[PDB]
A = this chain, B = another copy of it.
């Protein structure tokens, strides 16, 4: 009964729009956006995810620079690579594939990225800027979920929204995006006393919990919008989502099927960030 949000189709529309914009730039003599994607180590998951990023990068016609470093690359060498990419005016976005080898300080390395080239958008400065209602580059997964909400044509102003999975990296950012978008926002987490009462009052539910069946379909308010993205922002391979779909779908006005498009939306908004950076932040 609920209409379906198709994140995969919206991510494709978004890649298509970015590719066309890039074609309008290149004919106009404007610089093509550059994206450096850095991989360190052997992790099969990370090789697959990085591969999807670069495939999406090529489709959209960005200038791209691959850096497939070996796992024992020093922290300092990696800093010098990030220092050099910041000072390269041909590069608009710098991506450091996660997770990184144990010896590497994850936070130090990621925070070395100029916030205006941090197209993932989770650099602390970027989240802080979102927090104070003037984002530089928005965290791409939350941004991607706002795009999902936008496709429903719903008016978020005054909507009671609930974010389930505060502990997740997307959770706080997601809350800041929804507040920016006009919603009253409740954030819940593992220690929330009565999740059912919070969810049942919500016009909008965003769940990123990685806990199958956590949100009962009975908790969903009639007419609610339900976004179920789990904890993997790069690829959704779940057979069952955090929300119990059947009943949820009987009551929601809009729902994301599971597995859904969180990965493609995340990559699309990542590219969208790279383009914006080029058009707006780098001259």
Contact = CB atoms under 8 A, between A and B. Distances in A.
Contacts of A157: 191
B193 A179 contact: no
A237 interface: no
A257 interface: no
A81 B279 CA distance: 32
A165 B127 CA distance: 19
A276 interface: no
B128 A158 contact: no
Nearest to A129: B124
Contact of A187 (B126, B127, B132, B184): B184
Contact of A128 (B124, B185, B188, B189): B124
Interface in A78-132: 107, 122-129, 131-132
11 contacts: A107-B134, A123-B128, A124-B125, A124-B128, A126-B128, A127-B128, A131-B173, A131-B176, A158-B192, A179-B189, A184-B189
Nearest to A157: B191
A179 B185 contact: no
Contacts of A129: 124, 128
A60 interface: no
A185 B184 contact: no
A176 B127 CA distance: 12
B184 A192 contact: yes
A165 B187 CA distance: 16
